[PDB]
């Protein structure tokens, strides 16, 4: 009945001190836990082992800014300068061996957002339908959205000046280094493509709008 309780998500302004909490079930208040760091589409990472007194044995590649504290039930992650690259889900685990039978248990994780960060504006790459795809009476327009932070964009397409909802498919952002990247596609027919005079990929990021247009005429 071992139960690590964490809070779903935590927000700290950059540079400031971040203390994270893994409250242990009252019954097992004495246990050593591990801490783990999970970034999206990457194996989680051993951060430290953390005893009931405060003793912390930080794992390899865990720099000085990460430290450990303990307070009865609760077990703490302290990160000195809440730098951009610390943005992650912090998951704590515990091990128990009742009768030569070992069990390991994870808290739900805590999603750390770092705030007061300067933004990067999305830059746009658009491609028109290949002659090859056109020969097939299909036209996919391609909007590639790179070098943006933080990860939230909304993407819309317009045909001349009118929104297109139909045949629009937009990716989830993915972390490339300290910025993000996403794709959007507008699935038309070759005629729909040859009819219009323009088509527009519109990207909305943190109050800002970036637009790049194609001319089918070229």
């Amino acid at each position: 009945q071992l139960v690590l309780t964490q809070s779903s998500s935590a927000s700290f302004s950059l540079g400031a001190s971040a203390k994270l909490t893994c409250t242990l079930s009252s019954q097992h208040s004495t246990y050593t836990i591990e801490w783990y760091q999970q970034q999206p589409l990457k194996p989680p990472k051993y951060v430290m082992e953390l005893k009931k007194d405060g003793s912390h044995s930080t794992g390899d590649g865990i720099p000085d800014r990460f430290s450990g504290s303990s307070s009865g039930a609760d077990r703490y992650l302290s990160i000195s300068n809440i730098q951009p690259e610390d943005e992650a889900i912090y998951i704590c685990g515990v091990g128990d061996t009742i009768k030569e039978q070992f069990v390991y248990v994870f808290g739900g994780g805590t999603k750390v957002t770092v705030l007061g960060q300067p933004k990067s504006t999305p830059t746009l790459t658009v491609f028109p339908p290949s002659s090859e795809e056109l020969k097939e009476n299909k036209a996919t327009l391609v909007c590639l959205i790179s070098n943006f932070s933080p990860s939230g964009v909304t993407v819309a397409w317009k045909a001349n000046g009118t929104p297109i909802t139909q045949g629009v498919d937009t990716s989830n952002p993915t972390k490339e280094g300290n910025k993000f990247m996403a794709s959007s596609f507008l699935h038309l027919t070759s005629d729909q493509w040859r009819s219009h005079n323009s088509f527009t990929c519109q990207v909305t990021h943190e109050g800002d709008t970036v637009e790049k247009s194609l001319s089918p005429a070229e």
Binding site: P43, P44, G95, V142, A182
Partner: protein, 213 residues
């Protein structure tokens, strides 16, 4: 030096089973436990089980008894996890990890194995060269209507690595589409042949498309 290397992406059919493999290296297999963990939807991790590779002694999360079977092969130095009678819920990234016989930290982790449980139709990608519309030029490559994931996409078979961006895939009606861009100098393209290389192992297809002006 100490790595865990897990078996590749697996497409499994609902009601069938899958064997995922985790090979240890650059430490003594028999003097550590291999643990297995499931990436949970949204956020979090889910403990499956532990093998002691010396004795074959296994424990499990109650929820994985009858579902997960952990074997270990001393000869090959490889820990295996059988997952049985799979449904959509078993579709996840699974991580083998290593820890001390002392019930401690999962210190080293594998790269993950992505399991897809679906009955959707394995479909090779239609691949289209994306020449620039209308000193330097950005070329593209569209990978339309493939299933399952993954594909591997390179430029000149990895020989062109500088200026490559390969964008996250979208998924619509059990079909993936993905695009990739590269920026070269006008002295390179089009005087040199430049191809995107799209391998889809599940359909056993490989395509190289030349970008022509």
């Amino acid at each position: 030096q100490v790595q865990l290397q897990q078996s590749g992406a697996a497409l499994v059919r609902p009601g069938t089973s899958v064997k995922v493999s985790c090979r240890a290296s650059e430490y003594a297999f028999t003097n550590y436990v291999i643990e297995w963990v499931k990436q949970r939807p949204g956020q979090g991790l889910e403990w499956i089980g532990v093998i002691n590779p010396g004795s074959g002694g296994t424990n499990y999360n109650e929820k994985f008894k009858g579902k997960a079977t952990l074997i270990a092969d001393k000869s090959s130095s490889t820990a295996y996890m059988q997952l049985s009678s799979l449904t959509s819920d078993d579709s996840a990234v699974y991580f083998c990890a290593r820890s001390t016989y002392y019930s401690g930290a999962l210190d080293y982790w594998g790269q993950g194995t992505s399991v897809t449980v679906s009955s959707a139709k394995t479909t090779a990608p239609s691949v289209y060269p994306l020449a620039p519309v209308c000193s330097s030029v950005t070329l593209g490559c569209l990978v339309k209507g493939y299933f399952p994931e993954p594909v591997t996409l390179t430029w000149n078979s990895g020989s062109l690595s500088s200026g490559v961006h390969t964008f996250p895939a979208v998924l619509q009606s059990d079909l993936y589409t993905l695009s990739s861009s590269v920026t070269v100098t006008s002295s390179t393209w089009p005087s040199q042949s430049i191809t995107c290389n799209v391998a889809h192992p599940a359909s056993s297809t490989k395509v190289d498309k030349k970008i022509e002006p």
